[PDB]
Amino acid sequence: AECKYGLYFRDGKRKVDYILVYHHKRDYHEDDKRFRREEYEGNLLEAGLELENDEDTKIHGVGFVKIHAPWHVLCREAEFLKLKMPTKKVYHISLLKTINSVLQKITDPIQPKVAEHRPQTTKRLSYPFSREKQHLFDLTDRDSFFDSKTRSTIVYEILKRTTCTKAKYSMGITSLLANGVYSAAYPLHDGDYEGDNVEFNDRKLLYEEWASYGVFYKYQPIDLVRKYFGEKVGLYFAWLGAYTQMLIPASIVGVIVFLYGCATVDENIPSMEMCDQRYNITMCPLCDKTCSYWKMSSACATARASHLFDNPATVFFSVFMALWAATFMEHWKRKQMRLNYRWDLTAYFTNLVSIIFMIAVTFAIVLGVIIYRISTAAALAMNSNIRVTVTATAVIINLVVIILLDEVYGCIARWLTKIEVPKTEKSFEERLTFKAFLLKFVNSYTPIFYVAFFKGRFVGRPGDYVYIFRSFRMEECAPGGCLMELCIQLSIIMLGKQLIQNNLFEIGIPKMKKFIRYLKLREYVKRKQRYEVDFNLEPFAGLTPEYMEMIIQFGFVTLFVASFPLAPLFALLNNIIEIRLDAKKFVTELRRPVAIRAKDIGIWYNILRGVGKLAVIINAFVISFTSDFIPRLVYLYMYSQNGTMHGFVNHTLSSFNVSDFQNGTAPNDPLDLGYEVQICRYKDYREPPWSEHKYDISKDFWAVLAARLAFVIVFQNLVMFMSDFVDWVIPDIPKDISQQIHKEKVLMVELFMREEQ
């Protein structure tokens, strides 16, 4: 009623800045905990904080404690730290400008409706606040001089300072919370976000203008977000928006490159030769005692589909995407400085744990191939087009096991970090992030490397096959090739796993917790107090998973772009929804976090710059050994009489005598095709049967292998030099930002004169 529902004290003039809750159930350890609390409350009273208790609530066995801070305490704690406040001093801000004017005219309807977005040609000064010189800062209003966030930060620092006499080593509220004496501690929200009679506050404004699905095409009011939540939350959203901005130019060139291949697919000689039914090309079986001879005309659709994923445009696109990320890094580096300026921020256990971590990483690498092979075998056995359905089933089966193993890997990393004694609090996080990221990388990217580089390459020749354990034969690729399975894997992963299931789980997880709480608790007419309302929300976890998700997503776009031009387009649609999906959680679901000052994102910059450096070698090897670019180039300039591409499929096929088959390897029935077979054909570079040295490696095997090796040498060096040049050219600091500081310092000289004046 007169207390505005728990926001103020009983007298109505003291604002609650923090809330402590203890489990006072209606017993020697309980008495000891009570004595410790009482001593802590006495120390807090000695510090200079007003104290209050409430014991009459509907919830059983809970007590709430209110904390308040006076004016002199706030002044002293603000002067102790380096806190900058606005000053009455005001200065004016001091062809190419008409372009900015035109774009400002055009971009008017998309800007949000907030007070700060109004242009300001004058900016006030800012000087450290201290008790010695109070004339420089206007102290007209005490209430409006301090925001709620900076009011709660000082109280949190005071709570961290306090130590208990009984436990001299134990300091701060963290140890008390860890022991189990207290339950939780949290600041209060400003008010409601919905309601017809609700008065104006920042929560409702951010709900209407920022956290909604109907305003997905607007900008974000970053200043209000930083004012309400803090400087650690704002940098994440700024980085997300900057990352989302740079995908629009990259999502158009990929579409153009993809569309170029659809128009020129009906004039492709290699794909036209395979689909012709005038020849009678019989191929050898692909398995032992079960399969039989087939025909080349049965892979026409796969041959036609493979054309859209390799051509010179797909190499030009790789060269382009090589420089795109180098430009993005410089863009973010230059953007961070403006935000820094505007926000006024200018032994044996260790070795043993490291060895165990390497062992675990090796085992995690090992298990994935076994899981993939088992999934493929199960998918093949379940069925009995066939191939596409079998591949899709195998991928879908493997994804679930990956999802299940992620959590176990995370728990293992957490326990491994815990068993080793951490020196401080920052090193704990800096080590946990690395330990989790390595395991997530090796868990996510293992099956892709196997199909691209290792599947179907070490299998033998007809008549001399390779067996493992003397009883199992190595598997081969698809009849059309192994470039089609990679595209299906990438498409299925990117479209389903990262877009549908992830977001559905994110939305649906809190509902089960709410339902469980409702079932366990078991109407309300009187209005509950603020602390009782805030007690039913979910506590804040952190920002590590939010960064980890986007960092994992960043690797798919760059590492495997040489054979998938549509990768950048799939990420933009997800990033469009992710911003407004994450915005709602902070406003409507979680509890209010405390503010932390930061000047950079932190350790993720090094990870991004390592992935960007790693992408190039993989791109070069994928272009060299997975496609048919180099064989075509070699055939055109060495073996063609015309100078054209006639006879290329004729060139790449060998011959074999079906009468030389090993015992127990011939097909069961050779008359399914309807005619007798005497010679089958396979893909390799070996000698003909009608020769002195049959089935031997020929001279053309060695000529293509040097051409594949030289391409990597040229590509790697050229791309590395081009990537370094871009960093060299662009400066790291904007000119206007650096210019503005010098005049401010020149006037700050007279400000220093004003200090004694």
Ligand X SMILES: *[C@@H]1O[C@H](CO)[C@@H](O)[C@H](O)[C@H]1NC(C)=O
Q: For residues 317 and 619, what is the distance between their CA atoms, to the nearest angstrom?
A: 11
* Long-range Cβ contact pairs of 79-84 (< 8 A, separation 24 or more): 79/129, 79/130, 79/131, 82/128, 83/128, 83/129, 83/150, 84/126, 84/127, 84/128, 84/129, 84/344
575 touches 557 (CB < 8 A): no
- Rounded least distance, CB 460 to ligand JGX, Å: 5
Tell me the angle at which helices 567-588 and 202-209 cross, rounded to the nearest 10 degrees: 160
Q: Which stretch binds Ca ion (CB under 5 A): 37-45, 164-172, 244-252, 495-503?
A: 495-503
Q: Which helix (H) or strand (E) holds 296?
A: none
Say if residue 546 carries a ligand binding annotation: yes
Among 251, 268, 393, 624, binds ligand C14 (CB under 6 A): 251
C-alpha separations of 690 from 71, 282, 656, 678 in Å: 102, 19, 10, 14
Provide CB contacts within 8 A for 123, sequence distance 6+.
90, 91, 93
Among 73, 171, 286, 601, binds ligand JGX (CB under 6 A): 286
C-alpha separations of 139 from 82, 382, 437, 478, 623 in Å: 18, 78, 49, 78, 68
Q: Which stretch binds its own copies (CB under 8 A): 1-9, 89-97, 570-578, 704-712?
A: 704-712
- Rounded least distance, CB 739 to Ca ion, Å: 41
529 touches 582 (CB < 8 A): no
**Interaction of residue 462 with ligand JGX, rule CB under 6 A:** yes
What amino acid is encoded at 421 in this protein?
V
- Rounded least distance, CB 690 to ligand X, Å: 8
**Which residues ranging from 638 to 667 are in contact with ligand C14 (CB under 6 A)?**
none
Q: Which stretch binds ligand JGX (CB under 6 A): 75-83, 316-324, 345-353, 680-688?
A: 680-688
- Rounded least distance, CB 721 to its own copies, Å: 11
Kindly provide the b/e burial profile for residues 574-595, where b requires at least 16 CB atoms within 10 angstroms of the residue's own CB: bbeebbeeebebbbeeebbbbb
Say if residue 619 carries a ligand binding annotation: no
**Interaction of residue 320 with ligand C14, rule CB under 6 A:** yes
Residue 709 binds which entry of its own copies, ligand JGX, ligand X, none, CB below 5-8 Å type-dependent: its own copies
- Rounded least distance, CB 282 to its own copies, Å: 30
Q: Give the interface size with ligand X as a residue count (CB under 6 A).
A: 12
Q: Which helix (H) or strand (E) holds 664?
A: none
**Interaction of residue 457 with ligand JGX, rule CB under 6 A:** yes
Q: How far is C-alpha 116 from the chain's CA centre?
A: 31
Q: For residues 124 and 138, what is the distance between their CA atoms, to the nearest angstrom?
A: 13
The neighbour count for residue 653, using CB atoms within 10 Å, is: 13
DSSP 314-340: HHHHHHHHHHHHHHHHHHHHHHHHHHH
Say if residue 724 carries a ligand binding annotation: no
Draw the binding track, 496-535, toward Ca ion (x: CB under 5 A; -: no contact): ------x---------------------------------
How is residue 723 written in tokens? 């990537």
Residue 3 binds which entry of ligand C14, ligand X, ligand JGX, none, CB below 5-8 Å type-dependent: none
Nearest to 568 by CA among 556, 580, 577, 581: 556
Whole-angstrom Cα Rg for the chain: 34
C-alpha separations of 124 from 85, 89, 140, 462 in Å: 10, 6, 17, 83
**Interaction of residue 682 with ligand JGX, rule CB under 6 A:** yes
Residue 107 binds which entry of its own copies, ligand X, ligand C14, none, CB below 5-8 Å type-dependent: none
Among 709, 722, 746, 747, binds its own copies (CB under 8 A): 709
Evaluate the CA torsion angle 76, 82, 83, 88 in order and state its sign: positive
Q: For residues 376 and 469, what is the distance between their CA atoms, to the nearest angstrom?
A: 20
Evaluate the CA torsion angle 575, 580, 581, 583 in order and state its sign: positive
Say if residue 143 carries a ligand binding annotation: no
DSSP letter at 180 equals T
Say if residue 30 carries a ligand binding annotation: no
- Rounded least distance, CB 381 to ligand X, Å: 32
**Interaction of residue 469 with ligand C14, rule CB under 6 A:** no
Q: For residues 378 and 393, what is the distance between their CA atoms, to the nearest angstrom?
A: 9
Among 459, 614, 638, 720, binds ligand JGX (CB under 6 A): 459
Among 185, 284, 322, 623, binds ligand JGX (CB under 6 A): 284
Among 151, 334, 431, 681, binds ligand C14 (CB under 6 A): 334
C-alpha separations of 256 from 116, 564, 626 in Å: 40, 13, 23
**Interaction of residue 54 with ligand JGX, rule CB under 6 A:** no
Nearest to 162 by CA among 46, 252, 71: 46
Draw the binding track, 717-756, toward ligand C14 (x: CB under 6 A; -: no contact): xx--xx--xx--x---------------------------
306 touches 484 (CB < 8 A): yes
**Which residues ranging from 142 to 201 are in contact with its own copies (CB under 8 A)?**
none
- Rounded least distance, CB 107 to ligand C14, Å: 11
Residue 657 binds which entry of its own copies, ligand X, ligand JGX, none, CB below 5-8 Å type-dependent: ligand X
Q: Which stretch binds ligand JGX (CB under 6 A): 90-98, 303-311, 452-460, 559-567?
A: 452-460
- Rounded least distance, CB 86 to ligand C14, Å: 28
How is residue 742 written in tokens? 């010098």
Q: For residues 715 and 734, what is the distance between their CA atoms, to the nearest angstrom?
A: 33
Among 162, 175, 282, 503, binds ligand C14 (CB under 6 A): 503
**Interaction of residue 659 with ligand X, rule CB under 6 A:** yes
Based on CB atoms, which residue is closest to ligand C14, 59 or 256? 256
Task: Give the binding site for ligand X (CB under 6 A).
Answer: 279-280, 642, 644, 646, 650, 657, 659-660, 675, 678, 689
Residues that constitute the known binding site for Ca(2+) = 330, 503, 506, 546, 549, 578, 582, 727, 732
Task: Give the binding site for its own copies (CB under 8 A).
Answer: 617, 699, 702-703, 705-706, 709-710, 712-713, 717
Task: Give the binding site for ligand C14 (CB under 6 A).
Answer: 213-214, 216-217, 219, 241, 244-245, 248-249, 251-252, 300-301, 304-305, 312, 315-316, 319-320, 323-324, 327, 330-331, 334, 365, 369, 385, 388, 392, 434, 441-442, 445-446, 449-450, 454, 458-460, 466, 491-492, 495-496, 500, 503-504, 573, 576, 603, 606-607, 609-611, 613-614, 714-715, 717-718, 721-722, 725-726, 729
Task: Give the binding site for ligand JGX (CB under 6 A).
Answer: 284, 286, 457, 459-462, 476, 625, 682-684
Task: Give the binding site for Ca ion (CB under 5 A).
Answer: 502
